[PDB]
Design a binder for this molecule. Structure first.
Ligand SMILES: Nc1ncnc2c1ncn2[C@@H]1O[C@H](CSCC[C@H](N)C(=O)O)[C@@H](O)[C@H]1O
Ligand SMILES: [Zn+2]
Ligand SMILES: [Zn+2]
Ligand SMILES: [Zn+2]
Length: 430
């Protein structure tokens, strides 16, 4: 559109604006080059168009793929053929990672479509940065076993290029891949959007990437002047600059140097220390931060095998131990609270979930930017929890605060905004 590919010094390739864009303006949308629905969302969402419905039909062989109707099934078949039969043959042992699943889809799409797609207008998949020189042995070994898994499960319908070519491609996916989220930032699947991948990172982004099914769309969250580069955020903005740049060095191989990262303006309020008699020493804070970043990692591993009680305990005991130094507005406090809310939501313990939600909504607003999907998503969860617990007045308020951010982020007309407005109306009469 009114945009340009250029060389951003120290940032590689980037997107710059040829015209002014106001807050909420659509920069462009980009269709998905390749995409997959997560194993867990099978049945809830159409495998093809990513539409959440309760009346889906399944395949007459695998029974593991679900579609709106015949039309969605035929259109998805070239991609689904890759698994339908292997899911029957390997049955119990069918466990390729979502990266493998996605990479398969890319390789299939390259074979049936060697020419530049309408998804690669400025950046091509084959032009993706790979950072092969910066990868340690661990990552190279992960990639290697990804290749074997792909050979294992996908040999019956795909023809593989040489090993060294797949190494490049897998590195490209880990560096340019997108995850698709729904309203409540729930993980729907993985996808490639080559044109959106062109945008660089700021922890002060001027755009937001949103989704309308399998279509990605990019809207301005700040006034963009002609000549300015267009930035999204690759990461969750809640965390301190060090926690942020730790993730950026490890997954994308750079240190961010935007205004936020250079001045650390919001770092103090994020790691809020309890103001009290005998102010905790720099050593006791350094210890608790390490404990926090540590227990977060512990929890991430635990939530894949531990029971809800065990996970609730982790959240409770860590909250307790951190309480001695950290306020409730502290980011590491919010995290464990947010996790505990996840486990309450799993256990149909709606009242519990709501309490955690109330205790984390305000600090969220202070820590995130004004237009932030995390905030809107939290508002939405609160709105539906309130609304289901007979709190219609607080529910509507929370739902309207969601719409306020989403109108700018998703666009006034987004099917998500229709749903929310419809959830509001379902409780009133006029
Ligand atoms: N704020 C930033 N500072 C430096 N490099 C960045 C950056 N944001 C993104 N990058 C670089 O861009 C990659 C993400 S893909 C973005 C397109 C990329 N600039 C390209 O030339 O193809 C990252 O791996 C990183 O190397
Ligand atoms: Zn469909
Ligand atoms: Zn099938
Ligand atoms: Zn930054």
């Amino acid at each position: 559109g009114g945009l340009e590919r250029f060389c951003s010094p120290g940032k590689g390739r980037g997107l710059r604006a040829l015209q002014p864009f106001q807050v909420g303006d659509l920069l462009f949308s980009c269709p998905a080059y390749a995409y997959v629905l997560t194993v867990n969302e099978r049945g809830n969402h159409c495998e093809y168009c990513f539409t959440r419905k309760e009346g889906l039909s399944k395949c007459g062989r695998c029974k593991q793929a679900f579609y709106c109707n015949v039309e969605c099934q035929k259109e998805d078949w070239p991609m689904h053929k890759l698994e339908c039969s292997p899911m029957v043959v390997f049955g119990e042992n069918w466990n390729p990672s979502e990266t493998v699943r996605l990479t398969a889809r890319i390789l299939a799409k390259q074979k049936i479509h060697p020419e530049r797609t309408p998804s690669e207008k400025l950046l091509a998949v084959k032009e993706f940065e790979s950072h092969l020189d910066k990868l340690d042995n661990e990552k190279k070994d992960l990639i290697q076993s990804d290749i074997a898994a792909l050979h294992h499960f996908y040999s019956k319908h795909l023809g593989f290029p040489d090993n060294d070519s797949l190494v490049v491609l897998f590195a490209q996916v880990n560096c340019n891949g997108f995850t698709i989220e729904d309203e409540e930032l729930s993980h729907l699947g993985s996808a490639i959007f080559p044109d959106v991948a062109l945008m660089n990172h700021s922890c002060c982004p001027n755009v937001i990437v949103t989704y309308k099914g399998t279509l990605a769309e990019v809207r301005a969250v700040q006034e963009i002047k002609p000549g300015e580069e267009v930035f999204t955020s690759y990461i969750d903005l809640l965390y301190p600059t060090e926690d942020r740049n730790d993730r950026l060095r490890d997954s994308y191989f750079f240190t961010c140097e935007c205004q936020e990262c250079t001045t650390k303006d919001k770092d103090k309020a994020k790691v809020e220390i309890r103001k009290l008699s005998d102010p905790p020493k720099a050593e006791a804070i350094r210890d608790m931060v390490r404990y926090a970043r540590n227990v977060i990692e512990e929890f991430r591993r635990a939530k894949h095998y531990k029971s809800p009680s065990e996970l609730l305990e982790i959240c409770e005991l860590s909250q307790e131990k951190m309480s001695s130094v950290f306020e409730d507005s502290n980011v590491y406090m919010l995290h464990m609270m947010y996790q505990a809310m996840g486990v309450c939501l799993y256990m149909q313990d709606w009242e519990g979930a709501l309490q955690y939600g109330q205790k984390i909504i305000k600090p969220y607003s202070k820590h995130y930017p004004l237009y932030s999907l995390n905030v809107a998503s939290m508002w939405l969860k609160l709105g539906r929890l309130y609304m289901g617990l007979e709190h219609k007045a607080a529910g509507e308020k929370a739902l309207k605060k969601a719409i306020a951010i989403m109108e700018v982020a998703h666009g006034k007309d987004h099917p998500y905004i229709s749903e929310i407005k419809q959830e509001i109306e379902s409780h009133l009469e006029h």
